[PDB]
Amino acid sequence: MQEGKVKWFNNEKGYGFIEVEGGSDVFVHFTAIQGEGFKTLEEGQEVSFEIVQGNRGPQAANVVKL
C-alpha cells in the first residue's frame, strides 16, 4: 500500500492515472475506487492504493480518497 495523487481522470470514460513521487504512473479504473458515492476522481486528489498485475499490466486496487 502507498500514497499518490490523481494525475488526470476522464470522468466520462471512468479511468485515469495516479502519479507517484519517484515512481511510475499507475492506471486507475473507476471499479477500484472505494467508498460511497459516484465513482470518480479529480486531478490533484490524494489517494492511497495497492498495485496489482492484470492481463493488461499493472493497475490500481483499493483506491481510497484521503
Quickly count: other Cβ atoms within 10 Å of residue 55's Cβ: 4
Question: Binding to a second copy (CB under 8 A): which residues in 19-38?
Answer: 29, 31-32, 34, 36
Longest CA span, the chain: 31
Residue closer to Na ion (CB basis): 5 or 39: 5
Distance between CA 55 and CA 63 in Å, rounded?
A: 19
Q: Which of 14, 25, 62, 65: binder of a second copy (CB under 8 A)?
A: 62
Residues that bind a second copy (CB under 8 A): 29, 31-32, 34, 36, 50-55, 59, 61-62
